[PDB]
Amino acid sequence: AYPEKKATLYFLVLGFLALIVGSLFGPFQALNYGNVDAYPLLKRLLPFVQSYYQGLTLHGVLNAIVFTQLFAQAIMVYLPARELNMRPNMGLMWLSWWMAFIGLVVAALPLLANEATVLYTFYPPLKGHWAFYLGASVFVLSTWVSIYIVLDLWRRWKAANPGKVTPLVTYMAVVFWLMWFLASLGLVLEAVLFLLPWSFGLVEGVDPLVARTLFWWTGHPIVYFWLLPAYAIIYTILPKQAGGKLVSDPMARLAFLLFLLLSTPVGFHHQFADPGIDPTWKMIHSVLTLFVAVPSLMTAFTVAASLEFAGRLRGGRGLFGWIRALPWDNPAFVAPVLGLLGFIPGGAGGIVNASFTLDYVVHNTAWVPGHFHLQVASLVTLTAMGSLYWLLPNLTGKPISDAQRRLGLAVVWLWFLGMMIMAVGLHWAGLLNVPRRAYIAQVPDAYPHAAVPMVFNVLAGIVLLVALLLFIYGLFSVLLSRLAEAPLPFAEVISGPEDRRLVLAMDRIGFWFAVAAILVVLAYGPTLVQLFGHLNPVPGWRLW
Amino acid sequence: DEHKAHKAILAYEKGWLAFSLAMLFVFIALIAYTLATHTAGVIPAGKLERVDPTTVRQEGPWADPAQAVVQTGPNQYTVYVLAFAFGYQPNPIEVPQGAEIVFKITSPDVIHGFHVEGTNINVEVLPGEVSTVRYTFKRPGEYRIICNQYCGLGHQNMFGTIVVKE
Amino acid sequence: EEKPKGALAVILVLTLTILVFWLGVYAVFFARG
């Protein structure tokens, strides 16, 4: 009847397992930025770990690449399926899960064998093992099947409902997947044209600049790829969990449409500090980057209004009374909301980085990580943890005990607190110029000036280890323990007379797609044409 | 209640949007400002200037360290720097204060960062390409160079120094 | 009350946070030029 549940569960579990493993290195890294060298200890527990960096590669690959993608494939395929009450093509769906699992296993081997300590960005000339690139490529190509599966679902629903506007969750999933397709081309091109033939030994060198340029083409939109599955839940389900309704269908659609149009053509903002890239082009990408920030600013209001509406609806007292009125008893509700709070400082950090010249102050310092943990490690990861208290029950049939409820609730606050504390230690240490991606605890007297922010980092390191441990507990607890027949908590929407017009305009998906593609060609084409016309491949290195 | 709140939400949405765009344009203006000003010097030159990483330390401006510093005009100086695993050449880098320093940096191996603590100099150094950044240290002293781009196991201990003569 | 007041406060905090971080780093910027 509903074979999509099993597959969805496998994407979710595999994702959470990637989260557990990857995050094991997190605490030791926070202590490291707290000048406390705990890696000798880590090595006694995990004898395969050869260095701080191998540990970091696993951290970034398993959390920012594997866990996030798996959670998105689960959410952005399963929610639209359920909204439409239509079955995804199960042959492709399982095939997509096997590509992810096999690609993962193939990349894992070299990584765990210290054969690819190049970090999740794997910038040439650092040269990793062929199985790393091959496995990563297959893991990522897995999303192309997911894309086909959702467009196929949309296609089938349209056929059966001519003249009708695409339902909300499905509209979000379609532009989301079309956006990802356009975004993935940079990395797919980097892999197929250079990384793969290079690690396989067919070519001796790769051009570093064109490699970073194709990488960042995908590098920025991939975080939007990480974020949107969380935005879909925050827009369409959290309002109900909050005890209210989604105040606006059209604005939600607009936010997603702007992401389809602006997530990809902004990559030079990760290359402000790169040579060979025209300053004018950098300014254009800077402006476009400020624009892609708009969808989230709008989201800030639509979501807040929805939570306010729900608050006042259930006794919402004064100007802030609606806040205490929310279901702070439900972890499913708390997780995403705390995540949105931290997303505030997270976003400001982002607007700063996008400001071209201002980036030179924070680029490559501990600041970037402080900023992005509020983004992916906090908002996104907390929204995913929160789904344990509603999506899992929905997929397994097993409810959440008052105990499991209290635990996860403890996991969420401690996780959010750990991240806020760490965000203080990292932004500060970053303003103090401490470099990111560095084993500074190995050079104890290297940064005396950051002694105080380092205390935060050690503190955060302790808090988060507790959170992770409670999480691993709560997770296996909720799965091995012993509502399923109840639909997903899709919220009701408040419609208006203006809706229709706006909605029909945004429903011209084919047109908006072409516009999104055109924008990418205009933003990257000039630069890439000049790059491929003056390539300078250089030899690889294994400096570990 | 819902429709009344709905009406006020799309209304305030437009205003919010209006304010956001405006605020973003102010930021844009404050960015353009830095561009016209002399601070736009820490911005890497966009012109492609290729070199061979495997021979950079044997033939060319980076080969002889003693030739690293060059006078290219009135109170101006080009400093060919070499970033490698794991350090910088020359070391230290000695340059006059109040002078415009045109740094021309490159790598014979992997990518390195060139972050001069206390300054706005923070540029990625790519093998096969030359990173050209400009800067006038207006105060004497010792400016530590930090490699802020993972480049291998000797990354955390990769430092340089720029002594600006007084 | 019924006015999006609660939401307006949220985007106000947000706006202030963006302003602090921004002008703040902009200051550090000129202080490093």
Ligand code: HAS
């Ligand atoms: C999911 C993860 C991420 C998101 C989302 C994200 C968003 C942004 N980022 Fe970013 N980012 C950059 C710019 C931005 C901008 C402009 C945005 C924007 O999209 C952000 C917009 C955010 C907002 C406009 C805030 C909205 C606030 C909301 C929505 C909360 C409202 C709360 C409510 C409603 C609840 C209220 C509840 C109550 C109880 C009151 C730049 C530069 O331009 C760099 C390069 C830095 C460098 O130098 O290397 C960068 C680097 C990174 C890296 C490092 C990559 C590496 O390893 O090198 C990561 C991982 C990352 C992740 C993410 N980033 N970013």
Ligand code: HEM
């Ligand atoms: C227990 C929670 C966590 C802690 C304590 C933690 C801590 C850290 C620290 C201190 C760093 C900086 C290391 C360095 O710059 O050398 C780091 C980097 C990173 N973390 Fe986490 N992290 C945690 C969870 C996560 C999660 C859940 C994600 C995303 C899903 C994440 C993604 C990343 C990424 C992408 C990097 C950068 C990797 C790189 O630059 O190569 N972290 N984390």
Ligand SMILES: CCCCCCCCCO[C@@H]1O[C@H](CO)[C@@H](O)[C@H](O)[C@H]1O
């Ligand atoms: C790299 C190419 C890999 C191709 C793999 C094809 C797998 C075909 C799907 O098998 C699936 O396995 C699931 C259990 O795991 C079952 O629950 C599901 O009913 C079954 O259909």
Ligand SMILES: CCCCCCCCCO[C@@H]1O[C@H](CO)[C@@H](O)[C@H](O)[C@H]1O
């Ligand atoms: C899809 C399956 C791909 C299998 C690839 C097998 C061949 C791997 C070639 O690796 C090469 O080995 C050389 C000799 O050791 C190194 O000098 C070189 O740097 C490295 O790139």
Ligand SMILES: CCCCCCCCCO[C@@H]1O[C@H](CO)[C@@H](O)[C@H](O)[C@H]1O
């Ligand atoms: C996390 C938010 C609070 C941060 C508080 C500390 C900010 C310090 C910024 O000063 C910077 O210190 C550097 C040395 O560390 C100098 O080289 C640089 O020129 C100077 O601008």
Ligand code: CUA
């Ligand atoms: Cu050179 Cu890090």
Ligand SMILES: [Cu+2]
């Ligand atoms: Cu980005």
